Motif scaffolding. Structure first.
Motif, PDB file in Angstrom:
ATOM      1  N   UNK A  53       3.193   5.708   2.124  1.00 34.57           N
ATOM      2  CA  UNK A  53       1.747   5.508   2.050  1.00 34.57           C
ATOM      3  C   UNK A  53       1.096   5.928   3.365  1.00 34.57           C
ATOM      4  N   UNK A  54       1.224   7.219   3.676  1.00 37.96           N
ATOM      5  CA  UNK A  54       0.887   7.712   5.008  1.00 37.96           C
ATOM      6  C   UNK A  54      -0.588   7.503   5.334  1.00 37.96           C
ATOM      7  N   UNK A  59      -2.125   1.436  -4.962  1.00 39.15           N
ATOM      8  CA  UNK A  59      -1.254   1.510  -6.130  1.00 39.15           C
ATOM      9  C   UNK A  59      -1.390   0.235  -6.951  1.00 39.15           C
ATOM     10  N   UNK A  60      -0.952   0.325  -8.205  1.00 35.17           N
ATOM     11  CA  UNK A  60      -0.816  -0.822  -9.095  1.00 35.17           C
ATOM     12  C   UNK A  60       0.644  -0.894  -9.518  1.00 35.17           C
TER      13      UNK A  60
ATOM     14  N   UNK B  53       2.855   1.276   5.194  1.00 33.93           N
ATOM     15  CA  UNK B  53       1.406   1.090   5.150  1.00 33.93           C
ATOM     16  C   UNK B  53       0.787   1.506   6.482  1.00 33.93           C
ATOM     17  N   UNK B  54       0.935   2.794   6.801  1.00 34.65           N
ATOM     18  CA  UNK B  54       0.630   3.280   8.143  1.00 34.65           C
ATOM     19  C   UNK B  54      -0.839   3.082   8.498  1.00 34.65           C
TER      20      UNK B  54
ATOM     21  N   UNK C  51       7.697  11.123   3.986  1.00 34.77           N
ATOM     22  CA  UNK C  51       6.254  11.076   3.776  1.00 34.77           C
ATOM     23  C   UNK C  51       5.887  11.076   2.288  1.00 34.77           C
ATOM     24  N   UNK C  52       6.176   9.993   1.566  1.00 38.13           N
ATOM     25  CA  UNK C  52       5.727   9.902   0.175  1.00 38.13           C
ATOM     26  C   UNK C  52       4.286   9.422   0.106  1.00 38.13           C
ATOM     27  N   UNK C  53       3.558   9.928  -0.890  1.00 35.19           N
ATOM     28  CA  UNK C  53       2.116   9.716  -0.990  1.00 35.19           C
ATOM     29  C   UNK C  53       1.436  10.138   0.310  1.00 35.19           C
ATOM     30  N   UNK C  54       1.548  11.432   0.615  1.00 40.67           N
ATOM     31  CA  UNK C  54       1.180  11.931   1.937  1.00 40.67           C
ATOM     32  C   UNK C  54      -0.299  11.710   2.236  1.00 40.67           C
TER      33      UNK C  54
END
Lengths: 89, 89, 89, 89, 89
Positions: A53-54, A59-60, B53-54, C51-54
């Motif tokens: 979650x960069x 999200x759900x 959670x960056x 980096x998922x969900x970039x």
């Protein structure tokens, strides 16, 4: 060193024996399980990549486990001798 | 060193014996379980990557475990001798 | 070193024996399970790429496990001798 | 080193023995399972490529597992001797 | 090193023995399973190429597993001697 596990067993024996001799995520030189069984194991969120979650995400998270399930197992990892095993339902 | 585990057992014995001799996340030179079983094990949030959670995130976490489940196991990891095992439901 | 596992067993024996001697994600020189069975194992979100969900993403996560399922297993990883095994439902 | 696994077994024996001697994702010099069976195993989201959902994406994740399924297995990975095995439903 | 697996077995034996001696995704010098069977195994989303869903994508993911299926297997990976095996349904 000598390993005297099992000798001179005469009659009507059921025996389970195991012997082993040794003398982000990193694991070396290990053993998890020699005799391993597992039924319905679940893992959901573990070991996500670097920086999850960069930037600016939402999200759900829903997971449903509802259902009629029947496990019918008899004599699992257990030896018998001169026996009578049955499952009569 | 000598390991005298089991000798001279005459009749009608059921025996379970195990012997072993040794003389972010990092584990070395270990053993978890020689005889291991597990039923319905769950892990949800563990060992997330570096900086989770960056920046500026929000989530909704829901997990449902409702359901009719029936485990019917008899003689699991247990040996018998001159026995009668049954599951009659 | 000598491994004296099993000698001089005369009559009517059922025996299960295993012996082994040794003297982002990285694993070296290991063994998971010599005798391994697993029934209905599920893993959902693990070890996603770097980096998922970039940038600027949203998802809906639903998983349904509802269904009539019947496991009928008898004498799994368990030897017998002079026995009578049946499943009569 | 000598491995004395099994000698001098006279009559009516059913035996299961295994022995082995050794003295993003990367694994080297390992063995998973010598005797391995698995029934209905499922994995859904694991080991996605580098940078998944790179820019401005949204998904709907649904998976249905509802159905009448019947597993009828007897004497799986288990030897017999002087026995009577049947499945009469 | 000597491997004394099985000698001098006189009469009416059913035996299963296996022995082996050794002394994005990359795997080298490994063995998965010497005796391997699997029934109805499914994997859905794993090991997608580099940069999946590169720019501005949306998907609908549905998978149906509903159906009447009957597995009738007896004596799978299990030897017999002086026995009577039948499936009478």
């Amino acid at each position: 060193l000598m390993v005297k596990v099992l000798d001179a067993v005469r009659g009507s024996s059921a025996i389970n024996v195991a012997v082993h001799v040794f003398r982000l995520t990193t694991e070396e030189e290990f053993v998890e399980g020699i005799y391993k069984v597992e039924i319905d194991t679940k893992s959901y969120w573990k070991a996500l990549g670097i920086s999850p979650f960069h930037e600016h995400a939402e999200v759900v998270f829903t997971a449903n486990d509802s259902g009629p399930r029947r496990y019918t197992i008899a004599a699992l990892l257990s030896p018998y001798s001169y026996s009578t095993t049955a499952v009569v339902t």
